[PDB]
Amino acid sequence: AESGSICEARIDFVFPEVKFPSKKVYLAAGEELLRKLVEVHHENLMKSKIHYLFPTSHEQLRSLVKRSADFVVEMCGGPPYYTLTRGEPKMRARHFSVTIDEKAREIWLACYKHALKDVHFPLSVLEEFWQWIESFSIRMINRRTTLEPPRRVPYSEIQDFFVS
Amino acid sequence: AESGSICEARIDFVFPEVKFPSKKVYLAAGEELLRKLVEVHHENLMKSKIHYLFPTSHEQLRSLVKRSADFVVEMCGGPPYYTLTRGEPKMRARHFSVTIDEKAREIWLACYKHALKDVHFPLSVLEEFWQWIESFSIRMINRRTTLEPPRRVPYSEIQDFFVS
Numbered sequence A, B: 001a002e003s004g005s006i007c008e009a010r011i012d013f014v015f016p017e018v019k020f021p022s023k024k025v026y027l028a029a030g031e032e033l034l035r036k037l038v039e040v041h042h043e044n045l046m047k048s049k050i051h052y053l054f055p056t057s058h059e060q061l062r063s064l065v066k067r068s069a070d071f072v073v074e075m076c077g078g079p080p081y082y083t084l085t086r087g088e089p090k091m092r093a094r095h096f097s098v099t100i101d102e103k104a105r106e107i108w109l110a111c112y113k114h115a116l117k118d119v120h121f122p123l124s125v126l127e128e129f130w131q132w133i134e135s136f137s138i139r140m141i142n143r144r145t146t147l148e149p150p151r152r153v154p155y156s157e158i159q160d161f162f163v164s
């Protein structure tokens, strides 16, 4: 960068392909486990270093957990609890009101990995679920703090955690 | 986006090409005027809706105005005041230290439009300078709050303003 120079157009980071879970996940896990999963993720979050991002206030966060759970149940192939009640996901946009940097996503993911184990999510559909949130979560990042692309964490990296 | 769906890869917004000013800018304006331009731009910034982002302490304020003026003088073709002191520009990275959303860039730009007129920046190189900051400023944005791309402000939209 100096006088006269030309900087070509460039992109910061690409939002990778997102594979939504097949209906096998809803069938293997069932609605009750899915809802419990989200509740435990939320509990993990409230104990995490990003607890401050989350409305504290029983009514506030009881409605939030319910919403997230409806979203997860529907997207894993259950009934349309979410779109019948909130409509179009438009998730990135819904997250604009909260500051989400790269570290925030990693902690959100780590809390989810722990919840997946804590609730004994069936191993057979675990990768389908993981690869969904691992990639989808990248699109919620709205505060950049590095030139590096957001970290990828493939199931292969964490699978040993679920058999130990 | 639903169970089984595959959202393909995508980018948020492109950093468009940036044309840095030719040395003609420094030749036409001179070091004094470029430093006054930066000084005035900062006076405007302190009176603007992003005033909170900038220092209140007089010593810190002087330091930053100096760095920006050194950068502008150098980048317009003057002596290398910035690289000799602060070193490599890496401007996007240096700006991670402050939260900059789309509106912040718009306000920073409108403050610059007024400064440029206020100090009677030479008409021969005004467009060259404007197109540099209008595009370069896009790469400073590190907080996204909309799905829309950052607003483009071509010189043609504002050219009448400079001439009355």
Ligand code: HEM
Pocket (backbone or CB within 6 Å): A050, A053, A054, A055, A064, A067, A068, A069, A071, A086, A091, A094, A095, A097, A098, A100, A104, A105, A108, A133, A136, A137, A138, A140, A141
């Ligand atoms: C990337 C890290 C993420 C963080 C830190 C995060 C945090 C949050 C916070 C703080 C809210 C509440 C916003 C409010 O109170 O208005 C929220 C809303 C929500 N989040 Fe996330 N989130 C993340 C990613 C995701 C991902 C990947 C999904 C889905 C797979 C998701 C699903 C939801 C849903 C369904 C809601 C409620 C939306 C509604 O009200 O309709 N989030 N999130």
Ligand code: HEM
Pocket (backbone or CB within 6 Å): B050, B053, B054, B064, B067, B068, B071, B086, B091, B094, B095, B097, B098, B100, B104, B105, B108, B133, B136, B137, B138, B140, B141
């Ligand atoms: C787009 C909206 C922008 C905003 C809101 C903004 C604001 C700021 C702030 C708050 C600082 C001090 C940061 C700190 O020390 O913590 C700073 C530093 C600086 N800004 Fe910007 N800026 C913007 C764009 C630009 C552009 C486009 C340029 C150059 C064309 C620029 C040139 C500089 C320079 C040279 C510094 C000093 C860097 C150093 O410490 O060496 N800024 N800016």
